[PDB]
Amino acid sequence: VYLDRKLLTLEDKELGSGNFGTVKKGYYQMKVVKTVAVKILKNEANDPALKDELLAEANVMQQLDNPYIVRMIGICEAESWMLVMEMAELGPLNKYLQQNRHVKDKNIIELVHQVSMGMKYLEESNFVHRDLAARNVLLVTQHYAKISDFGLSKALRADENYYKAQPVKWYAPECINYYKFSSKSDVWSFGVLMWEAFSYGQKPYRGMKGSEVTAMLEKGERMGCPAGCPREMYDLMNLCWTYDVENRPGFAAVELRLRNYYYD
Ligand SMILES: NC(=O)c1cnc(N[C@@H]2CCCC[C@@H]2N)nc1Nc1cccc(-n2nccn2)c1
Q: Which cysteine residues pair off into disulfide bonds?
């Protein structure tokens, strides 16, 4: 659970930042060092929401064990609170495609299929991600994607099929209208993730407010087919963007459709 700060090296130059604080690269001496990515809570982890958001992520990651989900090494309590994870060496999918416009359609299918296998496992484990987007898919290699950023993720109780709540562009209508998050709402987000990936990390619904996205979706309109996107992958996006939750496919159906297409 708890790691020795003296066994952790952090590089000065951040990989990036969020509201939570910074992401730093380093290594942890567990033998052989392990390259790590570290979320460091800003301001000595003063904010109890941040600490819960780290713990939440930490607690979710701890419970999850799957090749397409980022693994946690532990928590280090030093200059700040640090969530220490296995390093996804090539970084977030949206950034990598933005800077590598040459990646082939076939390579993108392989990666989004890997995401669908991680999500299928999440759905089987009755977890809802609630932040599934290209920025929260991390590349280990050019051909190995993992899902990360479980800060908003919820372990569903056995007596429930959705989380009722107290990134709208990635949210299904029932999330916006009824505050209901299910594996089916994650399928909708996976639709937007696919559009992002075939759009080489472009933002969805460019220049639109959330309320305008809601209005467009209510009129039955959908984002157009990305340049070079195979028709079968745009068909699957549109299937993920099924308005009616009951008729939207789950990740079992999504993973099977991506598997069959990819391996043929
Ligand atoms: N390797 C991990 O285990 C890891 C887990 N989670 C995250 N989460 C971050 C939060 C901030 C947005 C981006 C992402 N969703 N990043 C990770 N690594 C990583 C590796 C290279 C670059 C970056 N990077 N580039 C810009 C910012 N961060 C991150």
A: none
